[PDB]
């Protein structure tokens, strides 16, 4: 289409969520999705967690799993409407462009230009484009036999090819100790513990979730993962990746060498922020990403959600949040402020790891931590302040959590405040 | 005192008068309310540092008046305003002005704030343009109270009055501050006491006026200028502890130096009103500081901010706040038409300019950039091999040159070839 009320670059959780968000607010509204990927919408937890404990031989084709079953997808390719028919259906719809880039944004004539050469004019702009898996410099230097056997998980087809590949190799390497390389290692641990295969885990933290749980809770996952067979490797900073009689040789700076078969490198994101330059849209030195306000708002009739987006929590400061329900909460609140909502963002995202903890906040290991065990919570603080708390192992006390956060108390005593989350008798307070 | 007004301006100065102007072009029957804590209605600030010091007239401090052609500091005559208990009825609407209130508290969810005496006022968009207040030094605020209330932060018109009352009772004023304010003052207090045969002294922690923000030629020669009009200039002079010793104000420098002195005029900087922010839960700058807001000077749905406590995002020079009295007006008049769904972003420059005798400015005028000055003359301030600021020494009517030049962002081979536009055909400096 050449014009289009709503447009949304990126098609991930994010644009999905605002395009049902504005759906539900204006019934006929006209939305077009535009994503350079080839795929529909979809959900991206699954692929590295639900999809490799499926007992259906055909989840590599179907994309189907177990919560009930359903699809990561997040609608049948039916709900869509075609793009050719979006300016002219009736009651309007969604439509999605599939294998388009975005790659000119221009702000004062309200106008993309495609790869293409394509231009589209909107009324209304989200970018929710994402970001890229980053990659190691000592991996940037190696040679192609290196970059040829090294996957940035990410996509289904990242899925697919390392399924295939861990069906076809005896050593996989993952190097990152956050969420990603963590649940790859126990998926690929399982599917290994089977098999006779070998996987490997190192990173640069003292533990699994380094830098997102304290110390000791740090440890426990660590241990976790060793449990399900994975060699994980702490205190690992990568020096050098070459070949070695065709294997694959990692030699650590601290002088240890690993020799595997494939790597997968599981490294932090980077935002897309490409249509910046041409847009004129400012991006944050600090955090990253687009700068937009509470609202999620760059400009007039821009607003940026996701991964990929630096917005202004009024409680917790400037921030970006690279999670799941973190891009369809922002994803729903854009789409709402694009129907005019003016809500700032104030429902907090949270995010969950079944091993299982809930969380919300500031989760960062790096500021002061208090943890109450009877289960038990973890209080992140900041000037005396609760600024992100980790629920273990506790359960239907988020709105607890909630309140807290947004009450923005100097507690006098935690231990009163572990009482919310009942833990009352045989405490133990833990200090970082 | 409205309790429901469409267009609320925070703050009864330059950028707030300007937005009233651009919001009333733009919507002839506009109703703004202007919300000012001083008593005094909108006027302008600079001829409190320089004309209504050179003025003929023994009555200017009752008067208010100067020459350039006379006029006012006010930016209108009284009678253009309307009343605010007659804003929401009069027909095709006006501006009004609540002298004497000041905006303590801001809730933005219910567009709703609570002045200093209770009333609360609802709006449809709203301005924020509190400026600032003048900084103090950490050495006068450990003083007793016998240093502070011989001391000056010279901002409004009452700071004129009790200073020009000061400098015409005492013997020596000691002016703490190289910067425009302080050197205006300097001049300003010179000549009054070349009169009487009184002292005038100028310390400041750099190498010369306006170090900050010119290069060191051209700051040793306003250091000069300063000098020849009596004043004992002290420059690189920090200030450790400041006391009374024989009723008699004494500054002692870190350096070992000691100043005796009568009065005390501090002008060592501004620091951004963002009261408001914390119970508008709106977001400030921790390194310019300020509001944060876009490049169209937008903070929330509808709340923008302008002038000196606005931080603003320019999309050609980058993050920036700017503290003087062209750009209060610029922004304000963005902000008003921003107010009137212009949606239009920060892209016409604002300037300013010193008569020294004169020179004009554009951009990120900051000695702590290189420069590359060519001699009349043009400085260029350059960041990545560009050029983002511009200083026109002794070189008039050329300004929409320099705005071109800092609007088209190249990266130049020869900036000889540049200060041919300038009419600049030579002594090349750099720094
Ligand atoms: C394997 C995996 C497992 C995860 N598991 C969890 C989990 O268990 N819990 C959790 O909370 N989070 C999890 N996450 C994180 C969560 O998936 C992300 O927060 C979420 O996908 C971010 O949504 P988004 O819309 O911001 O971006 P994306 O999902 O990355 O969508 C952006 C889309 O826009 C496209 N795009 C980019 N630039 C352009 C352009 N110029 N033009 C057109 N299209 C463009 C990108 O190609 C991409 O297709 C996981 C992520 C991965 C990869
Ligand atoms: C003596 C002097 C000389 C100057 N000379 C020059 C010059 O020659 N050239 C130049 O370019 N610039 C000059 N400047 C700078 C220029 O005057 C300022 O940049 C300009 O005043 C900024 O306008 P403003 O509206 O942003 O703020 P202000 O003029 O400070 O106006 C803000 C007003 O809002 C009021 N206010 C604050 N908070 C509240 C509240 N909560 N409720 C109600 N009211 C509130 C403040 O009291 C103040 O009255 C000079 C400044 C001074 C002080
Ligand atoms: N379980 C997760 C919680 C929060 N953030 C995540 C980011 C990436 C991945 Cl793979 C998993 C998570
Ligand atoms: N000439 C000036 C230019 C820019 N900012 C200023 C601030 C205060 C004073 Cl007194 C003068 C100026």
Not at 100 to 110: C, I, S, T
Not at 127 to 155: C, Q, W
Not at 174 to 196: H, M, N, Q, T
Not at 222 to 242: D, F, L, T, Y
Request: with cysteine.
């Amino acid at each position: 289409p050449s014009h289009v009320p709503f447009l949304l670059i990126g098609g991930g959780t994010a644009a999905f969520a605002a395009a049902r968000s504005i759906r539900a607010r204006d019934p006929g509204a006209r939305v077009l999705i535009v994503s350079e990927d080839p795929e529909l919408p979809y959900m991206r937890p699954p692929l590295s967690k639900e999809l490799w404990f499926s007992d259906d031989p055909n989840v590599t084709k179907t994309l189907r799993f177990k919560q009930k079953e359903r699809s990561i997808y997040f609608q049948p390719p039916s709900f869509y409407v075609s793009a050719q028919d979006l300016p002219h259906i009736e009651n309007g719809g969604v439509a999605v462009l599939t294998g388009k880039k975005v790659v000119q944004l221009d702000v004062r004539d309200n106008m993309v230009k495609l790869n293409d050469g394509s231009q589209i004019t909107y009324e209304k702009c989200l970018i929710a484009t994402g970001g890229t898996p980053r990659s190691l410099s000592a991996i940037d230097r190696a040679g192609a036999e290196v970059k040829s056997r090294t996957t940035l998980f990410r996509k289904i087809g990242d899925f697919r090819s390392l399924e295939k590949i861990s069906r076809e190799v005896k050593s996989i390497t993952i190097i990152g100790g956050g969420f990603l390389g963590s649940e790859l290692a126990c998926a690929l641990g399982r599917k290994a513990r089977a098999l006779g295969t070998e996987v490997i885990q190192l990173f640069p933290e003292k533990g699994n979730m380094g830098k997102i749980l304290p110390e000791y809770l740090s440890n426990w996952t660590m241990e976790k993962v060793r449990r399900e067979g994975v060699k994980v490797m702490p205190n690992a900073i990568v020096q050098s990746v070459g070949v070695s009689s065709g294997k694959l040789l990692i030699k650590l700076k601290d002088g240890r060498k690993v020799e595997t078969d494939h790597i997968v490198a599981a490294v932090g994101l980077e935002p897309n922020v490409e249509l910046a330059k041409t847009g004129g849209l400012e991006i944050d030195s600090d955090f990253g990403g687009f700068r937009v306000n509470a609202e999620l708002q760059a400009r007039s009739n821009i607003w940026v959600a996701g991964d990929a987006a630096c917005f202004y929590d009024i409680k917790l400061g400037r921030r970006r949040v690279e999670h799941h329900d973190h891009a369809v909460v922002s994803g729903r609140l854009a789409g709402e402020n694009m129907t005019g909502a003016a809500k700032p963002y104030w429902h907090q995202s949270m995010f969950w790891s079944d091993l299982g903890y809930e969380a919300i906040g500031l989760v960062d290991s790096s500021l002061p931590t208090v943890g109450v065990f009877a289960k038990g919570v973890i209080f992140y603080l900041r000037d005396k302040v609760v600024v992100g708390i980790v629920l273990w192992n506790i359960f239907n006390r988020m709105p607890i959590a909630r309140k807290i956060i947004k009450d923005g108390e100097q507690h006098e005593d935690l231990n009163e405040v572990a009482k919310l989350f009942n833990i009352h008798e045989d405490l133990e307070v833990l200090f970082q």
